[PDB]
């Protein structure tokens, strides 16, 4: 279910750490994330297992990482448990494709 207006509501879990208006605080800026390199913001202090993992943030890699982030990148500083429903993951990834 690729819906950006419902994905803004699921981004309610992300907005307390991650900033869409080009800014890097507790988490980095999620405006321009789909297709971006893993640890690829020169500006945010990333953990060493995020730099040693590598690749780029595709829809398949994002739905695995938003299911459990400390199981996929083993030793990331992201304190988030998971999005369990496929519907909520497809809604939020459609909003990350709008904020691209």
| Binding positions for ligand HEC, rule: CB under 6 A | 13-14, 16-18, 26-28, 33, 36, 38-39, 41, 46-47, 50, 57, 66, 76-80, 83, 92
Contact 66, 34 (CB under 8 A): no
Structure tokens given for 63: 């739905």
Cβ closest to ligand HEC, residue 59 vs residue 77:
77
Structure tokens given for 55: 């690749």
Cβ closest to ligand HEC, residue 50 vs residue 90:
50
Shortest Å, Cβ 78 to ligand HEC:
4
CA distance 79 to 22: 21
CA distance 1 to 35: 20
Shortest Å, Cβ 23 to ligand HEC:
13
18 is an annotated ligand-binding site residue: yes
Burial class (CB in 10 A: 0-12, 13-18, 19+), 20: middle
Cβ closest to ligand HEC, residue 47 vs residue 68:
47
Residues annotated within the binding site for heme c are 14, 17-18, 50, 78
């Amino acid at each position: 279910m690729a819906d950006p207006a419902a994905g803004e509501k699921v981004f309610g879990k992300c907005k307390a750490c991650h900033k869409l208006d080009g800014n890097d605080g507790v988490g980095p800026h999620l405006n321009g994330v789909v297709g971006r390199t893993v640890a690829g913001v020169d500006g945010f202090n990333y953990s060493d297992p995020m730099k040693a993992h590598g690749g780029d943030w595709t829809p398949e890699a994002l739905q695995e990482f938003l299911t459990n982030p400390k199981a996929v990148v083993k030793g990331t500083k992201m304190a988030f448990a998971g999005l369990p429903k496929i519907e909520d993951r497809a809604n939020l990834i459609a909003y990350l494709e709008g904020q691209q």
